[PDB]
mmCIF file of C-alpha atoms and ligand atoms in Angstrom:
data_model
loop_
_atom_site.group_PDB
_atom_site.id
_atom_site.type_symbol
_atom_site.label_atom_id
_atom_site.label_comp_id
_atom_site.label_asym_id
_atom_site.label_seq_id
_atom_site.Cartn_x
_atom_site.Cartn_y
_atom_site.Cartn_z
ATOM 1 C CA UNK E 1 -186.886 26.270 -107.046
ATOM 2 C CA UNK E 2 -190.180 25.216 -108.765
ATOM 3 C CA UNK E 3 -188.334 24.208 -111.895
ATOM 4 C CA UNK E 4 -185.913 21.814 -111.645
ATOM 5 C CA UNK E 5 -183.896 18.910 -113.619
ATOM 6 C CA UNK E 6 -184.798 15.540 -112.869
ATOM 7 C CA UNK E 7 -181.915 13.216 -112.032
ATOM 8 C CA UNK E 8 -182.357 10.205 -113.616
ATOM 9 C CA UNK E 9 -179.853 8.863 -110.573
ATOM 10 C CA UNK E 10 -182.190 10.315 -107.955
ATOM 11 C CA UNK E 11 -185.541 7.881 -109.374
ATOM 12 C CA UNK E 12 -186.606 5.247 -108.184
ATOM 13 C CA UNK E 13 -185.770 1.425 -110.076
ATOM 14 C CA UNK E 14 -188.526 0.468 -112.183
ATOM 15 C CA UNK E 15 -189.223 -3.292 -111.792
ATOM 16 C CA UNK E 16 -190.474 -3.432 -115.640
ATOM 17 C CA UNK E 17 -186.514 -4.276 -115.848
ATOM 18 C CA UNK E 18 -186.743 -7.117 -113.208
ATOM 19 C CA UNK E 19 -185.653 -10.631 -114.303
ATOM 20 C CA UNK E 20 -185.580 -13.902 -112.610
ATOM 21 C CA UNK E 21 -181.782 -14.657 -111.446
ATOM 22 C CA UNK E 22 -183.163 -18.023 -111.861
ATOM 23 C CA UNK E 23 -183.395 -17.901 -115.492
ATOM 24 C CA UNK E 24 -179.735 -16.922 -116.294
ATOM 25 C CA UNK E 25 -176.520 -19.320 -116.702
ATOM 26 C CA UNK E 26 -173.445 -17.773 -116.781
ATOM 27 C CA UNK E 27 -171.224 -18.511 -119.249
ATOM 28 C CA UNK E 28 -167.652 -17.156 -120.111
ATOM 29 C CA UNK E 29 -166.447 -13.706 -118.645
ATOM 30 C CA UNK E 30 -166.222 -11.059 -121.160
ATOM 31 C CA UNK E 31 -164.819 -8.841 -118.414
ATOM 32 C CA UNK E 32 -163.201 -8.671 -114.817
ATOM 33 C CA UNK E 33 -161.346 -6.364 -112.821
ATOM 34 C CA UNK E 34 -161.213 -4.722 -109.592
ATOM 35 C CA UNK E 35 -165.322 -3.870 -109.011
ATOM 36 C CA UNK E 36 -166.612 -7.204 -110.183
ATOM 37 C CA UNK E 37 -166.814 -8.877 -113.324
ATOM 38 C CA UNK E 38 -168.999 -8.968 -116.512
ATOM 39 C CA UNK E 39 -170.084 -12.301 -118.228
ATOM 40 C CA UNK E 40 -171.967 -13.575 -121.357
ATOM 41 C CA UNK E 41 -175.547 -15.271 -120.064
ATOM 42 C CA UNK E 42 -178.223 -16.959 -121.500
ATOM 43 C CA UNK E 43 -181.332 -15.719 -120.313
ATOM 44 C CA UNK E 44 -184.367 -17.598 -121.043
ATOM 45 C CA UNK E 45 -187.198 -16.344 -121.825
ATOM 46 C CA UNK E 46 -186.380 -12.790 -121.490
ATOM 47 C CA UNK E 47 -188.020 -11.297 -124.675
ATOM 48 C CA UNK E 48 -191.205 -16.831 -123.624
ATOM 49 C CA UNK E 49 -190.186 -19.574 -124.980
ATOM 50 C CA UNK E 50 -186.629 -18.360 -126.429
ATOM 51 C CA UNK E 51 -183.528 -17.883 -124.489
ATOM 52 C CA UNK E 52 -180.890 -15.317 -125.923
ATOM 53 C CA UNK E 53 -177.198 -14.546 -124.876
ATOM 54 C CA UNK E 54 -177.225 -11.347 -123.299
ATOM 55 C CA UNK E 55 -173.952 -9.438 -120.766
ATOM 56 C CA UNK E 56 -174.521 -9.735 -117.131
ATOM 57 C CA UNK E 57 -172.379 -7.087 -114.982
ATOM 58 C CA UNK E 58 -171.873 -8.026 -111.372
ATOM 59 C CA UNK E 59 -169.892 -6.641 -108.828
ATOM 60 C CA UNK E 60 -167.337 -8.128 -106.433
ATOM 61 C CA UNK E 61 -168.177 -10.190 -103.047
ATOM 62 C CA UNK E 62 -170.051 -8.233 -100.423
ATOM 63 C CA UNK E 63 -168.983 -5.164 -101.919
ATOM 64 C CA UNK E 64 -169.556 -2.066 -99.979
ATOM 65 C CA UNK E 65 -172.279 0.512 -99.925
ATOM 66 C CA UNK E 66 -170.959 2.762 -102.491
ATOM 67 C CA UNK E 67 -170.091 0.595 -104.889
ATOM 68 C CA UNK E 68 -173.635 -1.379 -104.885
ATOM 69 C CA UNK E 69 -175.358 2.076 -105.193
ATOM 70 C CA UNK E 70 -173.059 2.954 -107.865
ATOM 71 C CA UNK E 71 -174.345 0.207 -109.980
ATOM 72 C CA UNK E 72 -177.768 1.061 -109.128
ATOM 73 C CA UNK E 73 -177.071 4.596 -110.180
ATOM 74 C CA UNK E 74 -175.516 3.322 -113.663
ATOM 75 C CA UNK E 75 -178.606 0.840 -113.816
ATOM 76 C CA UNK E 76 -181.077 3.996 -113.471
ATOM 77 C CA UNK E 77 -178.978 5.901 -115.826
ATOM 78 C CA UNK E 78 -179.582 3.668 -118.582
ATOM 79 C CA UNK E 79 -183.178 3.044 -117.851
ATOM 80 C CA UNK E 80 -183.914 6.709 -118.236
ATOM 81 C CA UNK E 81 -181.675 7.079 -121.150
ATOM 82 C CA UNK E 82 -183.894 4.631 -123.633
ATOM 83 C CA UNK E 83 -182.760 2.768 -126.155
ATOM 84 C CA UNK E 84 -180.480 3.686 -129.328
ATOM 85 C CA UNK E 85 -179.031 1.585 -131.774
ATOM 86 C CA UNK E 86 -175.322 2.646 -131.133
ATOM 87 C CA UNK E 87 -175.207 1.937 -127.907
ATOM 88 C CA UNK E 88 -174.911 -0.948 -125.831
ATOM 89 C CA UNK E 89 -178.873 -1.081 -124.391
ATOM 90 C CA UNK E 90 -180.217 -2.567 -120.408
ATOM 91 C CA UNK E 91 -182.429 -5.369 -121.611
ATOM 92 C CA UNK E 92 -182.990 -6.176 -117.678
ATOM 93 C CA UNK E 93 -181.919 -6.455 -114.324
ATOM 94 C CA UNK E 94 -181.925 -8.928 -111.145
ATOM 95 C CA UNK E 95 -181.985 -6.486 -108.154
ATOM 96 C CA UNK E 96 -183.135 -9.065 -104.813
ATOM 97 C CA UNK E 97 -182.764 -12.771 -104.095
ATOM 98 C CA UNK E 98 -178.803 -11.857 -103.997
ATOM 99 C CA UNK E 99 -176.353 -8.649 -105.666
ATOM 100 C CA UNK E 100 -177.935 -6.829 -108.151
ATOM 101 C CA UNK E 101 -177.075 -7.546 -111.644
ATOM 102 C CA UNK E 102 -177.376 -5.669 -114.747
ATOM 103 C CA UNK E 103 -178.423 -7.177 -117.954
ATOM 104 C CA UNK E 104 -177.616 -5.598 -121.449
ATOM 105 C CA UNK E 105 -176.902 -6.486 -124.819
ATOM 106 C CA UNK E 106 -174.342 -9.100 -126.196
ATOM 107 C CA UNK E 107 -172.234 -7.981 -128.894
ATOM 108 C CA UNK E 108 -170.789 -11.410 -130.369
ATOM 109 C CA UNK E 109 -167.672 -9.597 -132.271
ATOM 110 C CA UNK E 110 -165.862 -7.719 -129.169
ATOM 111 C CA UNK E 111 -164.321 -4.749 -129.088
ATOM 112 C CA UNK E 112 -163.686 -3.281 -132.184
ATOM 113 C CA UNK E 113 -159.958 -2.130 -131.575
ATOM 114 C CA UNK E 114 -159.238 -5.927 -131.656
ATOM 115 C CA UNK E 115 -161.844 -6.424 -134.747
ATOM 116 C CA UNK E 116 -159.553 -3.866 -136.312
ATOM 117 C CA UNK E 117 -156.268 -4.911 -135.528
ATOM 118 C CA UNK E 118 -157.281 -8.822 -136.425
ATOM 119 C CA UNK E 119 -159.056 -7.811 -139.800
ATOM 120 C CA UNK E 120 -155.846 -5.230 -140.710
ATOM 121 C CA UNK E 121 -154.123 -7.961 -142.747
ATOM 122 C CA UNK E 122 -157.213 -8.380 -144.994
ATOM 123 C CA UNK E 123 -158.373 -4.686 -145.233
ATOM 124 C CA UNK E 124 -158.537 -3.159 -148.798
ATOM 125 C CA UNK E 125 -159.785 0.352 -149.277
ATOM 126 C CA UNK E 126 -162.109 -0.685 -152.195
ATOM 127 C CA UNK E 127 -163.578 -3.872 -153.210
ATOM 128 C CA UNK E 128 -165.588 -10.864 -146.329
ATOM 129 C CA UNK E 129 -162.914 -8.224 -146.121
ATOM 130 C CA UNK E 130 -162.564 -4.426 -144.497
ATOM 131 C CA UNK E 131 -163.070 -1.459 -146.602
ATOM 132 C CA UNK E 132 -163.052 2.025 -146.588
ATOM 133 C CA UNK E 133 -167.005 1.933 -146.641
ATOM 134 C CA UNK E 134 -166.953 -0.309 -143.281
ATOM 135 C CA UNK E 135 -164.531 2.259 -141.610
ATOM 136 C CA UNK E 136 -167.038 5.129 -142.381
ATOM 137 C CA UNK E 137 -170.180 3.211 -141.273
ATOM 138 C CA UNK E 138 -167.984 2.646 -138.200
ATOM 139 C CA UNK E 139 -167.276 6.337 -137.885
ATOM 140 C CA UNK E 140 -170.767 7.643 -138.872
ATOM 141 C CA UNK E 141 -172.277 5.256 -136.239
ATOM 142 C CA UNK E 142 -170.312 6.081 -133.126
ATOM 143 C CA UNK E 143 -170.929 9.778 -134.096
ATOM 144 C CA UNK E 144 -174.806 9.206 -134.192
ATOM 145 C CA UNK E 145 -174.391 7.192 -130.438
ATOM 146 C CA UNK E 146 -172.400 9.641 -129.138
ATOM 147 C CA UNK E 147 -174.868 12.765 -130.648
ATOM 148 C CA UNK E 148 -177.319 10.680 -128.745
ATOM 149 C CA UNK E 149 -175.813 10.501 -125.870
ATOM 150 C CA UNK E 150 -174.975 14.220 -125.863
ATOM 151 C CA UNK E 151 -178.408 15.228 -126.216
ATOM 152 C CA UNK E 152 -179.621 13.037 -123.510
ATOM 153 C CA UNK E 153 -176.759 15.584 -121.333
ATOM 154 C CA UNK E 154 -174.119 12.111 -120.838
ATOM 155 C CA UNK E 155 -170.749 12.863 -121.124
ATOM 156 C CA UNK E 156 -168.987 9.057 -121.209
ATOM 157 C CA UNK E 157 -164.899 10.036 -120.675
ATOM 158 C CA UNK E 158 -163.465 6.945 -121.954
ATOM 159 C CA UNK E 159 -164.209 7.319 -125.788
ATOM 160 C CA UNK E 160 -161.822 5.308 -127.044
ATOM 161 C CA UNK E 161 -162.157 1.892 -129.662
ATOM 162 C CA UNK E 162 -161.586 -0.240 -126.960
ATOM 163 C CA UNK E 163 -164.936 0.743 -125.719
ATOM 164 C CA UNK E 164 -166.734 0.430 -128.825
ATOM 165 C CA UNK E 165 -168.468 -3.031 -129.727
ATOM 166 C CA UNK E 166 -169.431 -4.546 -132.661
ATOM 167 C CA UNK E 167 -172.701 -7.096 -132.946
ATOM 168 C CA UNK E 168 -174.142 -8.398 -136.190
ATOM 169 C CA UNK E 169 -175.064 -6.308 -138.982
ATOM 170 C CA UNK E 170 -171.596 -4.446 -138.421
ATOM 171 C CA UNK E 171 -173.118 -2.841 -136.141
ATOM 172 C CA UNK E 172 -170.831 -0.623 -133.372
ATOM 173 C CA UNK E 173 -172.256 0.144 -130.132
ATOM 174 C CA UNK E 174 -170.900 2.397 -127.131
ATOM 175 C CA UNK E 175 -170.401 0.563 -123.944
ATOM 176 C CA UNK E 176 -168.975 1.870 -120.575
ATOM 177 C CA UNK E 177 -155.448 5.138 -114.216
ATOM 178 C CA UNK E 178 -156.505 7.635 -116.919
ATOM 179 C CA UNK E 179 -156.209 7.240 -120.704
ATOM 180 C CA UNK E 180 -153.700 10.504 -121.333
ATOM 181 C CA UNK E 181 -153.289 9.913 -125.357
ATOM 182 C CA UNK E 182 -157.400 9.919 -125.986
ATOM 183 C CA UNK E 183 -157.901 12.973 -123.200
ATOM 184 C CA UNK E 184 -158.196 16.709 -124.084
ATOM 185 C CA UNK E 185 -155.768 18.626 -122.923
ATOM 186 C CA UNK E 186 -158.208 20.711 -120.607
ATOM 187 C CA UNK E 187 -159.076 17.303 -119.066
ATOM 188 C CA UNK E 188 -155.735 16.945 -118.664
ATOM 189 C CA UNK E 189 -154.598 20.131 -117.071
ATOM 190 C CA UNK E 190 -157.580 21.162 -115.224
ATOM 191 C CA UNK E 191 -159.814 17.643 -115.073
ATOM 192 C CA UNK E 192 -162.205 18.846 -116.495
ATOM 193 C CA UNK E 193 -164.721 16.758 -118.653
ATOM 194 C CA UNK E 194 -167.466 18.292 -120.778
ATOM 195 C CA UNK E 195 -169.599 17.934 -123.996
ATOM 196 C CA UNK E 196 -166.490 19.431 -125.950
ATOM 197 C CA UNK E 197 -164.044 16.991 -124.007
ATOM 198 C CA UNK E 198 -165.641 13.630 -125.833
ATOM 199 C CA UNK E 199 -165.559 15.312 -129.160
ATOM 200 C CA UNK E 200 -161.858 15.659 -128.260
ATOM 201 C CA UNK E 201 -161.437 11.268 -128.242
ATOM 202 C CA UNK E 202 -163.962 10.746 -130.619
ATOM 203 C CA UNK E 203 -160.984 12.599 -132.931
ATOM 204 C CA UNK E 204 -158.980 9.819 -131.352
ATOM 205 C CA UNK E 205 -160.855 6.929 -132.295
ATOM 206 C CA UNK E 206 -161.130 8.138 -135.847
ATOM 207 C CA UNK E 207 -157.105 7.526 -135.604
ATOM 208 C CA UNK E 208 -157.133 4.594 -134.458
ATOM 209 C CA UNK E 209 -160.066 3.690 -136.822
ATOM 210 C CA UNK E 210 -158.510 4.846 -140.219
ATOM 211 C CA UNK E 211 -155.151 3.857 -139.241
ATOM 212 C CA UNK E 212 -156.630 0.157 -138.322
ATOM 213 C CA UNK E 213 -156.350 -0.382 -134.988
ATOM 214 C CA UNK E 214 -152.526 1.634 -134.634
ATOM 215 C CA UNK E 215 -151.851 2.927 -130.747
ATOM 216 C CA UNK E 216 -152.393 6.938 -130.916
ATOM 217 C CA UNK E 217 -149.408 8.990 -130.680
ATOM 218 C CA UNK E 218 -146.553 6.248 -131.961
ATOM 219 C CA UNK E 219 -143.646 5.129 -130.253
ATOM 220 C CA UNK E 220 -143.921 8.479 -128.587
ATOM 221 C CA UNK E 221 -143.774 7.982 -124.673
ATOM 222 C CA UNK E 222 -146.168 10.208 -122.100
ATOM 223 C CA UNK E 223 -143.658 12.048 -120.483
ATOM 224 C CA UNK E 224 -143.628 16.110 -120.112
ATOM 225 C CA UNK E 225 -142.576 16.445 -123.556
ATOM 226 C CA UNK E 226 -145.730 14.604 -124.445
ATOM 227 C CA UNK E 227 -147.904 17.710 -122.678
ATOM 228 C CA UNK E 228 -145.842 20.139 -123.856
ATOM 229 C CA UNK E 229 -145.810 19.298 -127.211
ATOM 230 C CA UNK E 230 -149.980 18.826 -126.898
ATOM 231 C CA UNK E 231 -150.282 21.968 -125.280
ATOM 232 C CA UNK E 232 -148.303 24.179 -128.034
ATOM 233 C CA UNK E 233 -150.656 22.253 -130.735
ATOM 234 C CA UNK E 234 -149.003 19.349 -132.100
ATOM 235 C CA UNK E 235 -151.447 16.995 -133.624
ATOM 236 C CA UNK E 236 -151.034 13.892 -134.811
ATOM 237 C CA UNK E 237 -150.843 13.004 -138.947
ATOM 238 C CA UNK E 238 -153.144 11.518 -141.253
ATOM 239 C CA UNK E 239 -153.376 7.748 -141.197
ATOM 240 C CA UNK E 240 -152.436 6.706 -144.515
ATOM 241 C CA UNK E 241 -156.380 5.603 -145.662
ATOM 242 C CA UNK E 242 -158.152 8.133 -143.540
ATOM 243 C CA UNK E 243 -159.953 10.279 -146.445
ATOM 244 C CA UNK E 244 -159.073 14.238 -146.051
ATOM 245 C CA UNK E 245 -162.408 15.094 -145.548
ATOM 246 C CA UNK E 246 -162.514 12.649 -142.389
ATOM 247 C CA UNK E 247 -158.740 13.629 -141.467
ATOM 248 C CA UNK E 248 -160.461 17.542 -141.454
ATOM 249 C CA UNK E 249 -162.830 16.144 -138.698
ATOM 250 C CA UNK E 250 -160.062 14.909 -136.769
ATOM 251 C CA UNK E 251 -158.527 18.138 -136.832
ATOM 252 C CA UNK E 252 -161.609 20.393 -136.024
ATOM 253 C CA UNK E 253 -161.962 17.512 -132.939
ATOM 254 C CA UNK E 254 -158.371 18.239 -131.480
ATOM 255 C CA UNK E 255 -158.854 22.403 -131.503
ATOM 256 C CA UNK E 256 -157.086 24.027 -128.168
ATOM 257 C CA UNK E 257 -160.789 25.860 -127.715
ATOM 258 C CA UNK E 258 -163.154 23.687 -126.659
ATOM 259 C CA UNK E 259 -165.719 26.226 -128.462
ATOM 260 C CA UNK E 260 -164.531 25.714 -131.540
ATOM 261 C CA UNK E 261 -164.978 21.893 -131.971
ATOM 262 C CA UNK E 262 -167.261 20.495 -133.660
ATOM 263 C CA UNK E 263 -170.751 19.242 -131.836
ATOM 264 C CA UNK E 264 -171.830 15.420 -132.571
ATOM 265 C CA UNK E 265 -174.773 16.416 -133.978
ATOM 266 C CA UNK E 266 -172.591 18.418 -136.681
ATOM 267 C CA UNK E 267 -170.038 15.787 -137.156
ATOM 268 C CA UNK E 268 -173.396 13.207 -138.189
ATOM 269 C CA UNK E 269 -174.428 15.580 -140.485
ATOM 270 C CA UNK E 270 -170.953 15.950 -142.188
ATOM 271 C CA UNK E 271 -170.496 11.986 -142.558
ATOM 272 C CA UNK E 272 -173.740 11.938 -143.574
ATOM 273 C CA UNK E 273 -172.497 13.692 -146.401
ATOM 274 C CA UNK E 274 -169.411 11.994 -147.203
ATOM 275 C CA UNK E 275 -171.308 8.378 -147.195
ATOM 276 C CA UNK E 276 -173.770 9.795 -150.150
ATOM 277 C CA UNK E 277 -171.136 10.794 -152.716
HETATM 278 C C1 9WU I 1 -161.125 -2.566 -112.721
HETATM 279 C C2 9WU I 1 -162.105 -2.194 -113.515
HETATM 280 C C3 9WU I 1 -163.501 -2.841 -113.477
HETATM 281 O O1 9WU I 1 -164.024 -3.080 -112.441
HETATM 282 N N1 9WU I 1 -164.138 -3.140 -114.758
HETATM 283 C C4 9WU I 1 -165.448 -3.705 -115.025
HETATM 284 C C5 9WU I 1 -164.869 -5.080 -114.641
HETATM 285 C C6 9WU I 1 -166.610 -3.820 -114.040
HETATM 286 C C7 9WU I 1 -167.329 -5.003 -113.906
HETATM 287 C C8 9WU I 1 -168.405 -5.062 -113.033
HETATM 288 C C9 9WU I 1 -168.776 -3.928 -112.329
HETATM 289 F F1 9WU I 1 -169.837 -3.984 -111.477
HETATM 290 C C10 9WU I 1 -168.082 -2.736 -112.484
HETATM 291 C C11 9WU I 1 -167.003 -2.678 -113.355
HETATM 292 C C12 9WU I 1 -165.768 -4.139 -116.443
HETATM 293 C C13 9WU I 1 -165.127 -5.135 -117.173
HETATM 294 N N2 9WU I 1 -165.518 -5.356 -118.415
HETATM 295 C C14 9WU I 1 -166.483 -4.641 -118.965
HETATM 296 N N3 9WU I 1 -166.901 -4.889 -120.328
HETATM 297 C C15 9WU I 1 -168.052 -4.094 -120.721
HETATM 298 C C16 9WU I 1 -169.086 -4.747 -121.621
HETATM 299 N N4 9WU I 1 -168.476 -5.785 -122.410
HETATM 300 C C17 9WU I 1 -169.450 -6.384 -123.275
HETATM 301 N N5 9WU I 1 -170.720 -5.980 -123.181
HETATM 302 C C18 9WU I 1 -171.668 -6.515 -123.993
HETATM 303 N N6 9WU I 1 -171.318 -7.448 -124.885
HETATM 304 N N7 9WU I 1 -170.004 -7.862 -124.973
HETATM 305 C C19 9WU I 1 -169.458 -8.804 -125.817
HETATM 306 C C20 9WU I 1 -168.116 -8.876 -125.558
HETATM 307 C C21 9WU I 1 -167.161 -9.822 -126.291
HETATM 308 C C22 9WU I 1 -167.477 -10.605 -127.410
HETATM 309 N N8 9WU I 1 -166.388 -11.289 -127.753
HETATM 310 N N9 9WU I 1 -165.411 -10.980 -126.900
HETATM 311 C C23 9WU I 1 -164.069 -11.541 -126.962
HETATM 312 C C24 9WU I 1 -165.816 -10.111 -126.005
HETATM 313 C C25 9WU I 1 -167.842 -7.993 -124.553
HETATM 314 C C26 9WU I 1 -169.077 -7.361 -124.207
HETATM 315 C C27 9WU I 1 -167.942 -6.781 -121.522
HETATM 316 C C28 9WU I 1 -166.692 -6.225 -120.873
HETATM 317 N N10 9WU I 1 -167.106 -3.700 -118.295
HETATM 318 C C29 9WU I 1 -166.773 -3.413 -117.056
HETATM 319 BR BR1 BR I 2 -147.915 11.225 -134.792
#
């Protein structure tokens, strides 16, 4: 028991994060739901004289002691995790003079599942439109955030495009009752989630990437036909403009043995390849 892991949960807050609540104004809300709500800010002076728009996540009214120490938790997370350009980073936090909220990064486009579906009129494969080569910096991105998070030992269980932002530069960032069509089916069966499990969506999103913005599985309904049909190995087809050699990712993604998908780490490496020829 001399050697242990360090759980970045179990640490203490570091006030280097601590902001003056007095020096944000809410603006609109980007986000609400049952737990609280999350809202574009301007907060001034955060990296002197400058204010910049930043996402504030709050929770509900006088929420109870789980909940606050769940955001705490989340807060520590991503304070030990350090910063990456694919994901959505803490820039700060407001933790007394009232709830504790959590200040990261504002990404001005959305979510890019809406980018997608609002920009699908005006894609064309090849040449302010979408391309092909937009799709695969999308791809090759989320793979590098998500080979990131891996290696810092995060699993994130929601991979899905609805979770992934875009913010200038076309730049995509990670952010964030269950969502059956992106799961893997030993998540399903046994609720499990694992390394292997997020590789399992990621092959998701790249569907709903290449096939701009389409719902996975069409017009098919999730019923016990649905699992049985997942379970004896039906995979979905090619979107029309995915390239093979992205569509053979996909595949290797949705494999019945966790084992044999492919790690994030290899998946950058293989887009990596694609993007130079
Ligand atoms: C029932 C469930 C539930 O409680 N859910 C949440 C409410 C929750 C809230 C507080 C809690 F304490 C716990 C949980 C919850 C709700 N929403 C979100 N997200 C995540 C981060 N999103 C953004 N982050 C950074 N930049 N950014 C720019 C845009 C943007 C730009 N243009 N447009 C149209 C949108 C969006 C973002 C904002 C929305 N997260 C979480
Ligand atoms: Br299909």
């Amino acid at each position: 028991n001399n050697y242990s892991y360090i759980d970045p949960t179990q640490l203490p807050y570091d006030h280097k994060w601590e902001f003056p609540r007095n020096r944000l104004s809410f603006g609109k809300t980007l986000g609400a739901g049952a737990f609280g709500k999350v809202v574009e800010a301007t907060a001034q002076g955060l990296i002197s004289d400058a204010a910049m728009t930043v996402a504030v996540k709050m929770l509900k009214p006088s929420a109870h002691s789980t909940e606050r120490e769940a955001l705490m938790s989340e807060l520590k997370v991503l304070s030990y995790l350090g910063n990456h350009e694919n994901i959505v980073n803490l820039l700060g936090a407001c933790t007394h003079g009232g709830p504790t909220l959590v200040i990261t990064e504002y990404c001005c486009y959305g979510d890019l599942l809406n980018f997608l579906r609002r920009k699908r009129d005006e894609f064309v494969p090849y040449k302010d439109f979408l391309t092909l080569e937009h799709l695969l910096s999308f791809s090759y991105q989320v793979a590098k955030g998500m080979a990131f998070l891996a290696s810092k030992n995060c699993i994130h269980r929601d991979l899905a495009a609805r979770n992934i932002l875009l913010t200038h530069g076309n730049i995509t960032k990670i952010c964030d009752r269950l969502p059956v069509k992106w799961m893997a089916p030993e998540s399903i069966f046994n609720s499990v989630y694992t390394f292997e499990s997020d590789v399992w969506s990621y092959g998701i999103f790249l569907w709903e990437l290449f096939s701009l913005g389409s719902s996975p599985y069409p017009g098919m309904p999730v019923d016990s036909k649905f699992y049985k049909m997942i379970k004896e190995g039906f995979r979905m087809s090619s979107p029309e403009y995915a390239p093979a050699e992205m569509y053979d990712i996909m595949k290797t993604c949705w494999d019945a043995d966790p084992d044999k998908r492919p790690t994030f780490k290899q998946i950058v490496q293989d887009i990596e390849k694609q993007i130079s020829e």
